[PDB]
Design a binder for this molecule. Structure first.
Ligand code: CLA
Ligand code: CLA
Ligand code: CLA
Ligand code: CLA
Ligand code: CLA
Ligand code: CLA
Ligand SMILES: C=Cc1c(C)c2cc3nc(c4c5[nH]c(cc6nc(cc1[nH]2)C(C)=C6CC)c(C)c5C(=O)[C@@H]4C(=O)OC)[C@@H](CCC(=O)OC/C=C(\C)CCC[C@H](C)CCC[C@H](C)CCCC(C)C)[C@@H]3C
Ligand SMILES: CC(C)=CCC/C(C)=C\CC/C(C)=C\CC/C(C)=C\CC/C(C)=C\CC/C(C)=C\CC/C(C)=C\CC/C(C)=C\CC/C(C)=C\CC1=CC(=O)C(C)=C(C)C1=O
Ligand SMILES: CC1=C(/C=C/C(C)=C/C=C/C(C)=C/C=C/C=C(C)/C=C/C=C(C)/C=C/C2=C(C)CCCC2(C)C)C(C)(C)CCC1
Ligand SMILES: CC1=C(/C=C/C(C)=C/C=C/C(C)=C/C=C/C=C(C)/C=C/C=C(C)/C=C/C2=C(C)CCCC2(C)C)C(C)(C)CCC1
Ligand SMILES: CC1=C(/C=C/C(C)=C/C=C/C(C)=C/C=C/C=C(C)/C=C/C=C(C)/C=C/C2=C(C)CCCC2(C)C)C(C)(C)CCC1
Ligand code: OEC
Ligand SMILES: [Fe+3]
Lengths: 37, 339, 38, 421, 38, 58, 333, 137
């Protein structure tokens, strides 16, 4: 860990990089709310 | 009072419970629970020495339901078996599960082919499916019954797990060189042939589908009157004929041949196993062995393999077979230079 | 054998020019069964 | 749910999408750089943790001393942040252009941005993006010659960041790499030994890109080009699609066999490095036990340590005989005419060389999904998986599927032209 | 399209995400035991 | 002053938290854009500024 | 002028085959491989696989029977280099260092590749879709993976995959003793793809056979076929969809013929897609799982999990694979 | 069958005094071993020099003696050939060679002690295995 003063955010930074994947997820929910077409 | 039950029972609902419905579900359910239960909660190191479940922390793969101890032979130790003496907990410690699963589970397979016969005389269809199903049932008995019978006991039968199956594979390679058996070879033929068919048939269809059948040009439609169906045999024919060189074009044959390949195969394979049950194998080529000993500058892949085996056997049999209690001194073990 | 190496390359490239020039081909181009655009 | 295929012709929405996924690519650039400088510990082999971009950043010799992890921490935080914000700068753009409204009917706009089937405009748009690569490429050149150097793993001592002078700009040398056998050690692009080749090899690209970007801008394709290629929108994907596949392969193989470009110091040792490293490690060990290396006779009669290569030089024996093509800074000083000098060997062998052998030999690219280090049989008490195996592995995969894509979309362009649509 | 209709694209998301939490565990859990391996 | 950065950041944090959730609903034509678009140039104006503050703080 | 007359030939039906631009390479290529290969198996002299001076001869004349083996891999010395004929000296040499291997391989892959192209191109001359091009791509890709990628990832064609029955087995064994595949999802999906295809190719053809047009000129003494001209086709899909649906449940059964045949080509192909990758992924050392230890921190007593007895066998074999060709303690490739 | 005090009641010096470690420590021993060792010393066997192990018995025959903690600590700071005639600091990890084995730079006296403890407690648990890899070989 070398972020110094920002120390505080390891958390959010740690679960951060996954979101690109979760984008795929909404995409299907978007579809569910729109009856799939 | 009879016919009624026939009907109530055979009543066409969501999940068809026929006359066979009585064997199938009680057995196919317990055979599943039996697995899942021990898989998640039982240890089999009193009987096998390894870790059986999740309770001890194996991964899904590792976890399994291990075979009884070799000291017991073929005694079906049911709960009221003179050996377990009715004490459940121990009945599990000893592996009384394996027997459970294989037996109930053997009948579930009996029920499932029966349920396949029922449905064909109610709907008025051909029994063929029920017959294709014999292959697996053969494979099953062949494996889990015939084989253990021929040998020292229940222990040597496949173990109910993932890895526990891979270990089976390997076991076979070392002591039986099952790969050299011709029967496993044919079996290996149909399974790979089943998948080769499944691709060409499915791809040919899909790709020879009738043009413009859908303006939007996607393909999610049909109907009963769609007698002709969505594709051409005439074009496939020529396609194949000019690419592969052959193409028997007669739909009825294509599908049946698709029954022959897979199923014909597994029957062999099962035969091949009734053979090993009696340590009767295809593990040697007298001709070669002979010239293999009178001459040291001669070697073939046949040979190189027989070497790996002994390695499998020497290293893997003392931990894998606790009952004889093998003690093998470092030096003794076969071993290539530097490794 | 150097005579062999040479012979090969001729053969090989020969059939290459037939692949390449068979596609760029102004003559046959991309002629299908349902529509010819020339 | 071919949703993304309904968008085909309404270029007003693609921009919205292309610039939306273009926002993820940059997002990842920050999310990962920051995730790394997060877990990252100084002075522990970059590669023994599990990093990938930082190593890239130190490749450009952005922040490092002679093969010394990092003296200056910061350089990475800059990258982590920048790209993470460029992800919003574009997330905004992609979203907007996706949702606020389509295109092609803006008169002054259609003059700046046209559509498909129009060879002269597609060509023009193409050249454009070509003028951009011509630049980015040349920027790399800047960062080595008049800027904070680049990391040369070669001569001497430690090869810290060094600035280049007069890159190999010879006209011949550059394409020679293109005309060489892609076999046994010699892969056209991979053969790149001298870092100076690499710089000069970039200068020529840009000039070639730019000289081309403008070319199509002004020119519409000739006849032969028109009668060979189709012009559907789907078909341009098939071109571009398969291009990337080849490259996936390209780079993958490029990854396994390092050129100074991928200094093994960050990335780790090369598959062969390990083996060759294991041979050398043991000459010494026994040399210290007074073993004579020249007269050694392995059970085969090939000498445990030294034998020849078909062209007759000396090479470490053992299966590591297949990696005598291997070259690195540690093994080289013992190299000389005719192969390895049996006299530098037993006389002039410095200690820091045994170290590298042992380290590499020790961190063999060999690993499993459980991150178990070493042979398939080891115990789970050692975690490691050479970045190279990670890059090579995942990237191979994509270069494959992607090819499956060249087939699927290019075969569907044959259905547009007249087939099934 | 929520006039106050009985949800389904919610049910589909509730469990779906729920499952991820159980499996997710199954991965965490796979760490607590092999971790003392030596 | 550690306090300003701990607030400037948390500042840019919360802004983004919102932005990313609002900006999308804002593009829901039947929910007035007049009101929603104001707030937009605000988060954007406010944000890019915070972006420069943090930076300058080092 | 002539040049035009040639192309027309190549392009359409020739009453035997279709030999388009793709088969312009495929036909002369696969021929050189066939011929060379057939002869190599009937007379090739011994070949020393691993550089060592211990030649292995798996040919008919030199004391083999069909299963015993065939065309053996190039030397480990030439291992990764390019070994053509011109590049060597006498053929007595060539024959010893595995020449036949490379020669046969490379031509075969190329022409193997083109056999695939040819499949598509025929589609373009017959206005049909381009799918078959894709389903072949699975095994092809796999061959390459086994015959190429690996030796490319490993450092020498030697130990690519022998062209004999027996050696196929060897390659397998050595392979899982070196990379432990069994426990790798990509080979797991592989068994899924295959055991899949078996279960489906039996299912389909089974049902398709049970729900036939019971009343079409079929008696108990004769059985004669259909032909495209036949409208209603062979079977009553309602009977099959009804059958299968009643065996498990409505959803379980397939409504239309597209979802049926698409499934048949989806399962197998995407299974091997992965396996072929599996190998290619373990070609650069990303070997399968390996849960070698589970403990009882009580004392730390190691408890053997079914998987360890798997490593016990994987072990015996590692030790003796390529006996006497190792001079150092740990294999690194 | 649990981890016991006796188990951790390990020899501290040549003469005859002993210290009984704790739970907390033991674990730090592993964690450290794996950190700058395992790679080269997996399961207590030298990869670079197979004919020399880390079993307890072989350590006592070293020069100077090494069946106890003080000896190991000395070794980790400064290295000693099995006989004690060469200074192998330019070859083996050593607090005196931090500059070359960066993994060492961070280490502290407390950590050496624990690492040493891990090496002496293990064999009581693993037995033959930790030696030449029995289960492992
Ligand atoms: C250059 C990039 C590229 C682009 C822009 C497109 C674009 C398109 N493709 Mg193509 N495709 C590509 C590459 C590309 N493809 C490649 C490389 C392949 C080979 C695999 C394919 C194979 C392909 C097929 C087979 C089909 C398309 C189709 C389409 C159209 C699809 C619309 C749709 O329904 O999407 C919907 C997309 C999805 C539901 C995505 C599924 C993605 C997988 C399952 C995710 C795996 C992620 C995994 C969970 C991660 C694990 C975590 C990791 C850390 C380990 C669209 C025009 C369709 C068409 O009809 O074309 C006109 C179609 O049938 N494509
Ligand atoms: C690679 C990613 C990807 C992308 C970029 C797109 C893009 C698109 N899809 Mg496709 N899709 C994908 C994957 C993708 N899809 C996959 C995998 C599937 C299969 C499940 C589909 C299935 C699909 C279908 C079935 C349909 C589309 C449609 C569309 C278009 C919708 C336009 C719109 O306004 O929607 C409405 C927009 C919203 C509901 C808003 C989403 C808001 C995002 C999450 C906000 C993120 C926050 C933002 C960055 C904040 C910025 C703040 C600033 C200060 C920085 C769009 C071009 C539709 C279409 O018909 O297109 C022609 C359609 O019907 N898609
Ligand atoms: C891939 C790279 C990329 C590309 C190629 C483009 C390309 C384009 N962008 Mg986009 N953009 C991008 C990335 C990209 N952008 C990103 C990442 C972002 C986020 C930072 C944006 C944000 C963005 C915005 C915010 C805007 C554009 C606009 C445009 C278009 C500008 C052309 C022009 O001449 O404007 C010059 C501008 C004009 C001629 C403006 C005329 C003003 C209109 C007609 C006023 C209407 C009001 C009227 C009074 C109403 C009467 C109604 C009555 C009821 C009262 C162009 C197509 C502009 C656009 O589409 O609008 C035309 C625009 O406003 N872009
Ligand atoms: C961004 C990539 C790019 C793309 C997609 C195109 C695409 C096209 N170009 Mg352009 N071109 C480019 C870059 C690009 N060019 C650059 C950078 C230059 C400057 C040298 C040119 C110079 C150029 C000229 C002078 C001409 C074209 C022409 C054409 C059209 C040719 C038709 C055809 O492909 O025939 C078939 C193609 C071939 C026989 C070539 C296959 C080549 C292989 C795949 C690539 C080899 C690359 C090289 C070895 C790698 C560099 C390695 C590095 C280490 C040095 C086509 C639309 C023609 C045209 O449009 O006419 C008006 C034309 O006359 N281009
Ligand atoms: C990063 C750079 C790099 C790149 C991009 C490649 C790329 C490639 N390598 Mg090489 N390799 C490298 C470095 C690299 N390598 C290094 C450093 C070494 C040192 C050990 C090797 C050692 C090596 C070996 C030992 C082998 C490869 C092979 C291959 C090819 C495999 C795919 C294939 O089957 O194509 C099939 C061919 C094509 C897709 C043709 C593309 C060309 C145009 C577009 C088509 C021409 C069409 C016509 C029909 C064919 C004429 C071909 C001609 C040779 C007769 C691929 C082109 C394999 C091979 O097949 O050799 C070439 C192989 O056996 N490589
Ligand atoms: C008799 C019982 C038995 C059972 C239950 C299993 C079960 C399994 N084996 Mg084992 N096996 C057995 C005996 C058995 N085996 C024997 C005797 C041997 C020889 C020693 C082996 C050798 C073996 C090997 C070598 C391997 C396996 C593997 C597997 C797994 C394969 C997954 C797969 O795709 O299968 C094929 C089946 C299918 C693809 C389909 C099954 C049907 C599913 C459940 C239907 C889903 C449909 C859904 C409910 C409805 C949708 C409706 C639709 C209309 C939309 C599976 C867990 C493989 C593995 O990966 O191990 C972990 C593997 O590599 N087995
Ligand atoms: C991976 C191997 C493989 C599996 C898992 C498998 C599975 C299945 N095949 C079925 C059918 C078929 N399979 C067929 C041909 C084939 N099936 C093949 C290979 C397989 N088939 C092959 C190679 C063929 C070609 C011959 C046909 C022709 C049919 C059908 O008609 C039928 C179907 O309807 O198709 C979907 C289903 C029968 C359900 C049943 O009867 O329950 C009753 C019995 C039960 C539940 C248990 C009996 C007890 C056994 C011993 C215990 C199993 C318990 C496991 C050990 C525990 C779980 C283990 C995990 C690792 C999964 C079932 C999903
Ligand atoms: C609803 C819903 C969401 C259900 C979820 C189910 C579920 C999560 C199950 C998980 C695990 C599982 C398998 C449990 C088994 C319990 C049990 C005793 C099950 C019986 C299972 C069983 C036999 C399943 C088969 C699944 C299935 C229908 C597979 C497809 C087979 C296939 C492609 C056949 C070919 C075919 C089908 C036709 O239909 C017609 C016509 C023709 C011609 C034809 O060839
Ligand atoms: C023993 C016994 C009994 C009982 C029991 C039973 C019968 C049971 C059962 C049980 C069961 C029955 C159980 C179960 C469990 C389960 C679980 C725990 C599961 C899980 C799952 C999961 C987690 C999933 C997932 C997934 C995903 C995510 C994706 C892919 C696919 C899948 C689907 C795989 C009695 C009394 C009779 C008597 C005799 C004995
Ligand atoms: C699915 C889909 C889609 C898509 C989407 C997209 C494409 C998106 C994107 C998105 C994006 C592209 C985004 C981005 C974002 C970003 C963000 C959100 C950021 C943030 C940041 C922050 C917060 C910061 C950070 C930091 C710094 C810089 C410093 C230090 C500290 C911290 C860590 C704080 C569409 C619509 C088409 C349609 C439908 C479907
Ligand atoms: C603002 C902000 C940010 C950002 C964020 C983001 C970018 C996020 C994202 C997120 C996301 C992106 C999420 C997602 C989620 C998702 C989900 C949760 C999903 C789900 C789904 C489901 C559940 C589905 C279902 C289904 C269907 C529909 C069908 C098929 C089957 C199934 C069942 C699978 C940060 C951190 C930088 C910091 C500062 C602030
Ligand atoms: Mn054909 O092989 Ca790849 O393992 Mn080690 O190195 Mn040579 O020994 Mn076997
Ligand atoms: Fe069919």
């Amino acid at each position: 860990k070398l972020p110094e003063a920002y120390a505080i955010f390891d958390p959010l930074v740690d679960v951060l990089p996954v979101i690109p994947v979760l984008f795929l997820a909404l995409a299907f929910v978007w579809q569910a709310a729109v009856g799939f077409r | 009072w009879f016919d009624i039950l026939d009907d109530w029972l055979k009543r066409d609902r969501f999940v068809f419970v026929g006359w066979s419905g009585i064997l199938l579900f009680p057995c196919a359910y317990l055979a599943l629970g039996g697995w899942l239960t021990g898989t998640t909660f039982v240890t089999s190191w009193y009987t096998h020495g390894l870790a059986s479940s999740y309770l001890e922390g194996c991964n899904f793969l590792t976890v399994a339901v291990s075979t009884p101890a070799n000291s017991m032979g073929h005694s079906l130790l049911l709960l009221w078996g003179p050996e377990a003496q009715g004490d459940f907990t121990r009945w599990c410690q000893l592996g009384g599960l394996w027997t459970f699963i294989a037996l109930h589970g053997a009948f579930g397979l009996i029920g499932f082919m029966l349920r396949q016969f029922e449905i064909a005389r109610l709907v008025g269809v051909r029994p063929y499916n029920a017959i294709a199903f014999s292959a697996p049932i053969a494979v099953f008995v062949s494996v889990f019954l015939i084989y253990p019978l021929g040998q020292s006991s229940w222990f040597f039968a496949p173990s109910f797990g993932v890895a526990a199956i891979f270990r089976f594979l390997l076991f076979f390679q070392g002591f039986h060189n099952w790969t050299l058996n011709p029967f496993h070879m044919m079996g290996v033929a149909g399974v790979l042939g089943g998948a080769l068919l499944c691709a060409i048939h499915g791809a040919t269809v899909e790709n020879t589908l009738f043009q413009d059948g859908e303006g939007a040009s996607t393909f999610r439609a049909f109907n009963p009157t769609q007698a002709e169906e969505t594709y051409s045999m005439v074009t496939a024919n020529r396609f194949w004929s000019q690419i592969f060189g052959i193409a028997f074009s007669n739909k009825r044959w294509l599908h049946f041949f698709m029954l022959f390949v897979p199923v014909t195969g597994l029957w062999m394979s099962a035969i091949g196993v009734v053979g090993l049950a009696l340590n009767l194998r295809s593990y040697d080529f007298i001709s070669q062995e002979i010239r293999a000993a009178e001459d040291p500058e001669f070697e073939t892949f046949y040979t190189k393999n027989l070497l790996l085996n002994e390695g499998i056997r020497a290293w893997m049999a003392p931990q894998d077979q606790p009952h004889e209690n093998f003690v093998f001194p470092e030096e003794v073990l076969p071993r290539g230079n530097a490794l | 054998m150097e005579t062999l190496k040479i012979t090969v390359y001729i053969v090989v490239t020969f059939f290459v020019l037939l692949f390449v020039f068979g596609f760029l081909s102004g003559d046959p181009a991309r002629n299908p069964k349902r529509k010819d655009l020339e | 749910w071919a949703g993304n295929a309904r968008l085909i012709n309404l270029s007003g929405k693609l921009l919205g999408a292309h610039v939306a996924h273009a926002g993820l690519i940059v997002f990842w650039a920050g999310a990962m750089t920051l995730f790394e400088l997060a877990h990252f510990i100084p002075e522990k082999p970059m590669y023994e943790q599990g990093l990938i971009l930082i190593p890239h950043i130190a490749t450009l010799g952005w922040g490092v001393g002679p093969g010394g992890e990092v003296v200056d921490t910061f350089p990475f935080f800059v990258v982590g942040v920048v790209h993470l914000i460029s992800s919003a700068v574009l997330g905004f753009g992609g979203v907007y252009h996706a949702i606020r409204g389509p295109e092609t009917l803006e008169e002054y706009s259609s003059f700046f941005g046209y559509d498909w089937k129009d060879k002269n405009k597609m060509t023009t748009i193409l050249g454009f993006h070509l003028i951009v690569l011509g630049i980015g490429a040349l920027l790399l050149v800047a960062k080595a010659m008049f800027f904070g150097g680049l990391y040369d793993t070669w001569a001497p001592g430690g090869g810290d960041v060094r600035v280049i002078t007069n890159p190999t700009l010879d006209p011949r040398v550059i394409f020679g790499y293109l005309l060489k056998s892609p076999f046994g050690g010699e892969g056209w692009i991979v053969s790149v030994n001298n870092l100076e080749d690499v710089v000069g090899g970039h200068i020529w690209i840009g000039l070639i890109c730019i000289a081309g970007g403008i070319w199509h801008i002004l020119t519409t394709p000739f006849g032969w080009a028109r009668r060979a290629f189709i012009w559907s929108g789907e078909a341009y994907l098939s071109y571009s699609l398969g291009a990337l596949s080849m490259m996936g392969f390209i780079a993958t193989c490029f990854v396994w066999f390092n050129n100074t470009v991928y200094p093994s110091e960050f990335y780790g040792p090369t598959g062969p490095e390990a083996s060759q490293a294991q041979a050398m490690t043991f000459l010494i060990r026994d040399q210290k036990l007074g073993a004579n290396v020249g007269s050694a006779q392995g059970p085969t009669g090939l000498g445990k340590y030294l034998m020849r290569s078909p062209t007759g030089e000396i090479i470490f024996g053992g299966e590591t005989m297949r990696f005598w093509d291997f070259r690195g800074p540690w093994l080289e000083p013992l190299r000389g005419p005719n192969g390895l000098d049996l006299n530098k060997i037993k006389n002039d062998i410095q200690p820091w060389q045994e170290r590298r052998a042992a380290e590499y030999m020790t961190h063999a690219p060999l690993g499993s999904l459980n991150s178990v280090g070493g042979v398939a049989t080891e115990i789970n008490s050692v975690n490691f998986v050479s970045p190279r195996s990670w890059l090579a592995t995942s990237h191979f995969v994509l270069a494959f599927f992607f090819l499956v894509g060249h087939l699927w979309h290019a075969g569907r362009a044959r259905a547009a032209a007249a087939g099934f649509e | 399209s929520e006039g106050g209709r009985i949800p389904l694209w919610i049910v589909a998301t509730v469990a779906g995400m729920g499952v991820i939490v159980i499996v997710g565990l199954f991965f965490y859990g796979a760490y607590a035991g092999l971790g003392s391996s030596l | 002053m550690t306090i300003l950065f701990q607030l400037a950041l948390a500042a840019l944090v919360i802004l983004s938290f919102v932005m990313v959730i609002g900006v999308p609903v804002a593009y829901a034509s039947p929910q007035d854009w007049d009101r929603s678009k104001q707030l937009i140039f605000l988060g954007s104006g406010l944000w890019i500024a915070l972006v420069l503050v943090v930076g300058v703080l080092n | 002028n002539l040049w035009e007359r040639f192309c027309n030939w190549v392009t359409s039906t020739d009453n035997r085959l279709y030999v388009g631009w793709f088969g312009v390479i495929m036909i002369p290529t696969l021929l050189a491989a066939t011929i060379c290969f057939v002869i190599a198996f009937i007379a090739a002299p011994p070949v020393d696989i691993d550089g060592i001076r211990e030649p292995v001869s798996g040919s008919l004349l030199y004391g083999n029977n069909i299963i015993t083996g065939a065309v053996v891999p190039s030397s480990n010395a030439i291992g990764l280099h390019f070994y053509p004929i011109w590049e060597a000296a006498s053929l007595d040499e060539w024959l010893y260092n595995g020449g036949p291997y490379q020669l046969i391989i490379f031509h075969f892959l190329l022409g193997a590749s083109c056999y695939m192209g040819r499949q598509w191109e025929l589609s373009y001359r017959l206005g049909m879709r381009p799918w078959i091009c894709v389903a072949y791509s699975a095994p092809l890709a796999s061959a390459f993976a086994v015959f190429l990628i690996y030796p490319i990832g490993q450092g020498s064609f030697s130990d690519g995959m022998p062209l004999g029955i027996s050696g196929t087995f060897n390659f397998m064994i050595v392979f899982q003793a070196e990379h432990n595949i069994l426990m790798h999802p990509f080979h797991q999906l592989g068994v899924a793809g295959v055991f899949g295809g078996a279960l489906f190719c039996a299912m389909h053809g089974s049902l398709v056979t049970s729900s036939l047009i019971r009343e079409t000129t079929e008696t108990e003494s004769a059985n004669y076929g259909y032909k495209f001209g036949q409208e209603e086709e062979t079977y009553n899909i309602v009977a099959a969809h009804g059958y299968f649906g009643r065996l498990i449940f409505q959803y379980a059964s397939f409504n239309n013929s597209r979802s049926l045949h698409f499934f048949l080509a989806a399962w197998p192909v995407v299974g091997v897609w992965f396996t072929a990758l599996g190998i290619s992924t373990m070609a650069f050392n990303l070997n399968g799982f390996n849960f070698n230890h589970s403990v009882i921190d009580a004392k730390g007593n190691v408890i053997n999990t079914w998987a360890d007895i798997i490593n016990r066998a994987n072990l015996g074999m590692e030790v003796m694979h390529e006996r006497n060709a190792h001079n150092f303690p740990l294999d690194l490739a | 069958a649990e981890l016991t005090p006796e188990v951790l009641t390990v020899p501290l010096n040549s003469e005859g005094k002993t210290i009984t470690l704790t739970e907390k420590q033991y674990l730090e021993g592993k964690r450290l071993f794996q950190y700058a060792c395992a790679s080269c010393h997996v399961g207590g066997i030298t990869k670079t020099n197979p004919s020399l192990d880390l079993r307890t018995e072989t350590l006592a025959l070293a020069t100077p003696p090494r069946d106890n903690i003080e000896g190991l600590v000395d070794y980790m700071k400064n290295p000693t050939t099995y006989d004690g005639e060469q200074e192998i600091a330019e070859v083996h990890p050593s607090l005196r060679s931090a500059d070359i084995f960066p993994k060492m730079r961070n280490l502290t006296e407390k950590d050496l002690v624990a690492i040493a403890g891990h090496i002496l407690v293990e064999p009581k648990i693993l037995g033959d295995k930790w030696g030449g890899g029995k289960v492992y070989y």
